[PDB]
């Protein structure tokens, strides 16, 4: 009864935030530019200092002609209006939005301590605790995205970030989207996209345990379970039903990964009467405090090197570009509820 009565006090929050969501918080000229931490087809992302009060954030910055042509308008309108509906703990938390005649802007929490994937890549593997304990964070971010009708459709490394404490940040909503029942987009990312993406099924929140799955088998042996040179390869490695373990993995956790890795997703760990208790109760978790994990009172496996909340050493450089803001404004209808 307490996480029912948790998640029913966590929709009601979600739902009226959601029906009425915020707008035009903040505008460009209160912030400086400091870095550009990572940029896309469409938008990047970059350091900003808020000039009034000196607090640092990460401030997402949408071309808005660019996501018409890449016809990515509802996914950008969904990223938006989630991020300012949600809260938990383990979701970076957005604090402004904004828009202007060029671009849409998400000013969001800064993490210092970047990427899990630079973190993986720099160590090869986590061992079985350190991947246990980012695991054990998604599993209950996805109790909570999920008790909301939420897909959130791009589990990987790159969206994982490290914040100050150890803890799992979750950033990039740019896929996330509210479902009762199926949904039909094509997106994710190649190397984690469930079978029923790959072919093009009406799916649902199944996609996010077979990615939580490829994740956790990415944690524990340094690279996915289905790798190639090609993404047609690897889509057909996905929907085969076969992966292989290194030897080093546990037989518990190879068995909670045929679960989660499991293509026909009526017998999916996650999907099946018991929902997301199927993978809470499994002996591969038999360690893990539920309730210290989401009370953030476990001592992580380590903390992040950096030297204060405007240190962007463990974040990669870029070419310093523009924003440029059109004296004409440009696709005003599109991003109306923006
Ligand atoms: N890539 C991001 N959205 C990000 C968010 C917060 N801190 C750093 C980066
Ligand atoms: N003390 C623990 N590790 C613990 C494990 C499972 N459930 C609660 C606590």
Same mark, same amino acid.
């Given at each position: 009864?307490?996480?029912?009565?948790?998640?029913?006090? @966590?929709?009601?929050?979600?739902?009226?935030?959601?029906?009425?969501?915020?707008?035009?918080?903040?505008?460009? $000229?209160?912030?400086?530019?400091?870095?550009?931490?990572?940029?896309? %087809?469409?938008?990047?992302?970059?350091?900003?200092?808020?000039?009034?009060?000196?607090?640092?954030?990460?401030?997402?910055?949408?071309?808005?002609?660019?996501?018409?042509?890449?016809?990515?308008?509802?996914?950008?309108?969904?990223?938006?209006?989630?991020?300012?509906?949600?809260?938990?703990?383990?979701?970076?938390?957005?604090?402004?939005?904004?828009?202007?005649? %060029?671009?849409?802007?998400?000013?969001?929490?800064?993490?210092?301590?970047?990427?899990?994937?630079?973190?993986?890549?720099?160590?090869?593997?986590?061992?079985?605790?350190?991947?246990?304990?980012?695991?054990?964070?998604?599993?209950?971010?996805?109790?909570?995205?999920?008790?909301?009708?939420?897909?959130?459709?791009?589990?990987?490394?790159?969206?994982?970030?490290?914040?100050?404490?150890?803890?799992?940040?979750?950033?990039?909503?740019?896929?996330?989207?509210?479902?009762?029942?199926?949904?039909?987009?094509?997106?994710?990312?190649?190397?984690?996209? @469930?079978?029923?993406?790959?072919?093009?099924?009406?799916?649902?929140?199944?996609?996010?345990?077979?990615?939580?799955?490829?994740?956790?088998?990415?944690?524990?042996?340094?690279?996915?379970?289905?790798?190639? $040179?090609?993404?047609?390869?690897?889509?057909?490695?996905?929907?085969?039903?076969?992966?292989?373990?290194?030897?080093?993995?546990?037989?518990?956790?190879?068995?909670?990964?045929?679960?989660?890795?499991?293509? $026909?997703?009526?017998?999916?760990?996650?999907?099946?009467?018991?929902?997301?208790? $199927?993978?809470?109760?499994?002996?591969?978790?038999?360690?893990?405090?539920?309730?210290?994990?989401?009370?953030?009172?476990?001592?992580?496996?380590?903390?992040?090197?950096?030297?204060?909340?405007?240190?962007?050493?463990?974040?990669?450089?870029?070419?310093?570009?523009?924003?440029?803001?059109?004296?004409?404004?440009?696709?005003?209808?599109?991003?109306?509820?923006?």
């Amino acid at each position: 009864e307490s996480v029912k009565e948790f998640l029913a006090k @966590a929709k009601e929050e979600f739902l009226k935030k959601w029906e009425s969501p915020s707008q035009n918080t903040a505008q460009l $000229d209160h912030f400086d530019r400091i870095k550009t931490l990572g940029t896309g %087809s469409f938008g990047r992302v970059m350091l900003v200092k808020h000039k009034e009060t000196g607090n640092h954030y990460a401030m997402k910055i949408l071309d808005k002609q660019k996501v018409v042509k890449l016809k990515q308008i509802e996914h950008t309108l969904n990223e938006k209006r989630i991020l300012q509906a949600v809260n938990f703990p383990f979701l970076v938390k957005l604090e402004f939005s904004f828009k202007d005649n %060029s671009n849409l802007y998400m000013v969001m929490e800064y993490v210092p301590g970047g990427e899990m994937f630079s973190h993986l890549r720099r160590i090869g593997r986590f061992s079985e605790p350190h991947a246990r304990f980012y695991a054990a964070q998604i599993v209950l971010t996805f109790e909570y995205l999920h008790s909301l009708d939420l897909i959130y459709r791009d589990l990987k490394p790159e969206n994982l970030l490290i914040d100050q404490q150890g803890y799992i940040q979750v950033t990039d909503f740019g896929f996330a989207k509210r479902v009762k029942g199926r949904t039909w987009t094509l997106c994710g990312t190649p190397e984690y996209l @469930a079978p029923e993406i790959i072919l093009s099924k009406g799916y649902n929140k199944a996609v996010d345990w077979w990615a939580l799955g490829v994740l956790i088998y990415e944690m524990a042996a340094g690279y996915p379970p289905f790798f190639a $040179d090609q993404p047609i390869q690897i889509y057909e490695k996905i929907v085969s039903g076969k992966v292989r373990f290194p030897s080093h993995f546990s037989s518990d956790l190879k068995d909670l990964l045929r679960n989660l890795l499991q293509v $026909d997703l009526t017998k999916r760990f996650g999907n099946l009467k018991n929902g997301v208790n $199927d993978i809470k109760n499994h002996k591969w978790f038999a360690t893990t405090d539920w309730i210290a994990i989401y009370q953030r009172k476990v001592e992580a496996p380590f903390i992040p090197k950096f030297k204060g909340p405007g240190d962007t050493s463990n974040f990669d450089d870029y070419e310093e570009e523009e924003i440029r803001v059109s004296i004409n404004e440009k696709c005003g209808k599109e991003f109306t509820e923006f």
